[PDB]
Design a protein around this ligand. Sequence first.
Ligand SMILES: CN(C)c1ccc(O)c2c1C[C@H]1C[C@H]3[C@H](N(C)C)C(O)=C(C(N)=O)C(=O)[C@@]3(O)C(O)=C1C2=O
Lengths: 50, 1022
Amino acid sequence: ADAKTVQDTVTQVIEQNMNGIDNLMYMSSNSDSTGTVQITLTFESGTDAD
Amino acid sequence: MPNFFIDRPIFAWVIAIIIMLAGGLAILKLPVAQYPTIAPPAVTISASYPGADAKTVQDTVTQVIEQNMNGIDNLMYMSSNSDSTGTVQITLTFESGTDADIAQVQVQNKLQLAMPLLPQEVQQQGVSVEKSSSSFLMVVGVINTDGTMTQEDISDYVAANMKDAISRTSGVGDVQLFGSQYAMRIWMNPNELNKFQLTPVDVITAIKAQNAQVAAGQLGGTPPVKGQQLNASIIAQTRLTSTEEFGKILLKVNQDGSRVLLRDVAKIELGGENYDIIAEFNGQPASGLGIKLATGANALDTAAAIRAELAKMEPFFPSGLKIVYPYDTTPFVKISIHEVVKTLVEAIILVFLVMYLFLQNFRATLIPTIAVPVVLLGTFAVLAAFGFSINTLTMFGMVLAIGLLVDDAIVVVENVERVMAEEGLPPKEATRKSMGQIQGALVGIAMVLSAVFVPMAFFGGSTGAIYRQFSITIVSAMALSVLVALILTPALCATMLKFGWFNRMFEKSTHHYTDSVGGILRSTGRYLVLYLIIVVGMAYLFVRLPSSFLPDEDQGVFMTMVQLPAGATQERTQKVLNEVTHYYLTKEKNNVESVFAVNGFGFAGRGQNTGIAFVSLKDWADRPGEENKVEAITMRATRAFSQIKDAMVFAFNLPAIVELGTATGFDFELIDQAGLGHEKLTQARNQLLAEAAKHPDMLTSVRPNGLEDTPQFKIDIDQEKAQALGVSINDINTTLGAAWGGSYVNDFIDRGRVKKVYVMSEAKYRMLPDDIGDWYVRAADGQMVPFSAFSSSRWEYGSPRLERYNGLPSMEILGQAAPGKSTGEAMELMEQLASKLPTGVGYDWTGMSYQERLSGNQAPSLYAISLIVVFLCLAALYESWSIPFSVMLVVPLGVIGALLAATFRGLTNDVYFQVGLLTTIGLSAKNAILIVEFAKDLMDKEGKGLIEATLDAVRMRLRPILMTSLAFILGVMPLVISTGAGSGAQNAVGTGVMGGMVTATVLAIFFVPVFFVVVRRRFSRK
Ligand SMILES: CN(C)c1ccc(O)c2c1C[C@H]1C[C@H]3[C@H](N(C)C)C(O)=C(C(N)=O)C(=O)[C@@]3(O)C(O)=C1C2=O
């Protein structure tokens, strides 16, 4: 029961903060109707995933 | 090798090109920041509890939380604040180079298990965990200079339309807003409220149901019916998004169709979430944004892009929202970079000027000019090899060293212009013989200079990190050099190599000189004394000479500290800020560029009571005379601000490395170590404080860095009476709660942004212990009941700030050493004074005092091992367990004279001094090794004069020294040693090297050719 709602409520927020993190190349999130959200960060090759 | 290289010099330019390439490309990969990272890694832990107080925070939250920091790796110590405004910081400093990213995990990670025991008020505000830095890169400010937007208004914008915009820009390692963002405010009044028999709770529990976010399946999705067609998503209740819809909330309805709306019982409007810190820029409403570096990005680079992004977006939203920059640590860095660069560049011009005056040539002075930039560049690649960076510390690292490579160059091309001179052969055969008589010396002095340098970078903590900066710099330059002077120079001067007021005024002063030195050497131990004075002298000057870390400097800004007393008030505090502002703009109007003033940011707590005012002056330029400088402007201020009402208002210049170990002072912490309550500790604290005033011998200013108990208004619910009337102990407390300290209902959305919703009494019904009488609660039978009915009130003292060191109620005192005595010996007293307190009370040293204690004194222990490797190394340069001795006794010469940073100027043993004091002992013992080389060499090869050589030795030597030692001093003499601004360390570095270098030459010309004589004759003697 949540159009936008999710994004801008959980999405934007978790996104706002994904800043700082080293070796970041691009972020891309997809807020979903089902209420599901999926933020995704990907780093420069080599970077140490743990 | 060089002999194989002089033969193919074609190649020893490829070796030279590579290096230059590496060092060029490395330049670009270099990050640039003002300093490097030198504080051990800390981690704060903040927390809120709207309307609490220290106990009601130390025992609901800071404890608890803290009973759980167990499990976490490399931790040094952990303190914690619990003050009277709902705040809880809880920073945790950690061993030297532990991985910050991984410590913050666990710290944080381990919080995650206490939250279950935090109270629900707190877990809603949420506890954040982050890395302790509170003062970095630049701090944009956003004011409105046409009274439209208030603090909160401006904050919002800055939050809503630009904060993230910056936040994601090449650099921006973290933003921190200087205000809030709107929040649904809902200020009730017991009156309009008690008239409907509704309390805060009734209001609270409505703003819930009414403003919430429900759930409601699709249509198909989950298993549907055969042959269905439309699946759609149902959209049930969803959060209000306005003061409008908020205004309309069914709170009550009673036989009248009576419509009692949230709009009646109180008053709705957007506003800020916290309201107790008034920011304003030059008497204008303001709401800045601070921005921290980035980790590995570039101070310059990223400042520029911030300025970019800010530009581009300022063409927006009505009323002039003008972006100001009351702080940018960048101009300061760039001007340093711009100097130093000239120091080097010019240092070379010097080696061209000097050297000409000495070697009739040109294609000779072209050599060190092709060696220097080759050695610099290229060390810029060793810096990038060890992950280092272009920062103040690392730069002066090569300037303090400019004189060590430059030398090296001259030294080679001037032995060739002797050998092909003193009945020599052509360029080739000259080099071969020349570059081959200093060959092994040029090495060996390698291994030597590696010690008396390496040893740094082994030191303590916060410091010692600095030291490392310097150490690897130099040694990376230094040795990199010695390597080109065995490869590119010996092929560069061969292959290239072919006024009366000099030459015709030198060839004879040499002779006068060596002659003068000639004889005066029979009674050898003539000047064996005289010297012994010198040494003994230093051993005086040293002790006499004061100590420091880094000389403070004029930077963009500095600050004033206001502090109204005991229980003052934001409003009463503002006026003080307005003055501070005034007696700054308008009475210092040709220097103060702006004052950014905020009340609520004390430096030893918060509260309406204290504030602080950061002032940004105008460009070092428009600030000419020493009177127009910081270490001057603040003087006026400090005083001019005495003569102020009950309002301690200080002003002072920030230290070199904001975020680092301040004064040579101490940081002491008195621990609760048992039962003993607040009180007992206080009496304890007070014992020792007073005890130490009685001792201004060992100097002091022992001061509790913390807050005296103030009085406090104490409610007190009568449980029984509560039970007797129909009145819930819960219902009471939320009403009194909410009312007076305000509660944070739930969220709502506002122009696409979730934002909090607070609800608390108007200000009118919550200022005075009276008013409490305005508040009514609905009881069981449904009759409003006043406080007095079930509660009584008394004054009393309690602590607005409860502080506590690792786990345990503590109290922190700080103070200085002694205008005479050492930080060290001053701690020791403080400790004996501690030694006699009541039993319960323990004591522990934190902070600067932590390192200083732990590591601290090692200078001895370390350089012992150098002075040994120096010997060893040196001994096998020659081939005796004694001869090297003739190389060592140089150390004192250079030292004295370098120590006339005392007797000539007004300085201190500060780092920049000691690094130089090393750079200086390198040319000194270098000189020695050579003169003691050519001492034997022709004494050993041509079996020459047991003393005859010595004279000749020094002869073929007075020009190298005189040559270099000239271009140096002059090189170090410029703005270096005479400066205005963005400097400090310039005076630092020069002055040290400037003297001492004098004595190193002008005094070793005589001794070193001695020494060698006084010895080389004490061994196998009769
Ligand atoms: C002193 N510190 C650098 C400044 C300077 C200027 C400012 O204008 C401000 C601060 C602190 C920040 C802290 C923040 C905090 N937070 C990020 C929401 C916060 O928890 C509070 C609070 N005490 O409730 C603020 O007052 C606060 O909103 C605030 O208004 C600030 C603020 O206005």
